[PDB]
Amino acid sequence: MKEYTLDKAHTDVGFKIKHLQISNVKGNFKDYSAVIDFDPASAEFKKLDVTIKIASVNTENQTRDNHLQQDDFFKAKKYPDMTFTMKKYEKIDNEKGKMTGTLTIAGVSKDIVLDAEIGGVAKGKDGKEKIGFSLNGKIKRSDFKFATSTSTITLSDDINLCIEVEANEKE
């Protein structure tokens, strides 16, 4: 034989090991419309109807938003918009209430509950009405047979909705 010493400069004592990481995908939608009927005298919603243009999804990541439109997610070509229709608002007090409505995603419709939290009701600077409130709720992918080809392991079955609204009076 013969004896050698390592060139530490061009020697790597290396290893690769695979692991998993859980993170939240957070997203919103840039293009939606809503109709809002609300009574500041009683803190009650009368009508809340929302249409969201699926195409305008934004999860902060270009190629994911594209992929979201595909046949194995939103199927945007066939079902371009998702919709919420309030059916009933059960007031708890002037800050909180339970909202029940129909959510439709890719042509499957289901009745859901959102927790309404009224952030603020005012007459503005100019003397016209404003309101600020939030709706939230967990819905289940499985209940809307949504993205069924993706496992509930890879992607959580639960979607948490956070609707944050500031809104002013009309006409």
Q: Which two tokens stand for residue 134?
A: 């939030």
Per CATH, which fold does 22-171 belong to? Lipocalin (2.40.128)
Q: Which helix (H) or strand (E) holds 66?
A: helix 62-68
For residues 103 and 82, what is the distance between their CA atoms, to the nearest angstrom?
8
Radius of gyration from C-alpha coordinates of the chain: 24
Q: Tell me how the structure was determined.
A: X-ray
Angle (CA) 58-63-65 rounded to 5° is 30
Q: What is the DSSP letter of 21?
A: -
Angle (CA) 21-105-97 rounded to 5° is 85
Q: Which two tokens stand for residue 38?
A: 């609300």
For residues 160 and 134, what is the distance between their CA atoms, to the nearest angstrom?
13
Residue with tokens 């010493």: 5
| Residue 104: count of CB within 10 angstroms of its CB | 16
Spatial contact of 106 and 146, defined as CB atoms under 8 Å apart? yes
- The angstrom resolution of this structure is 2.9
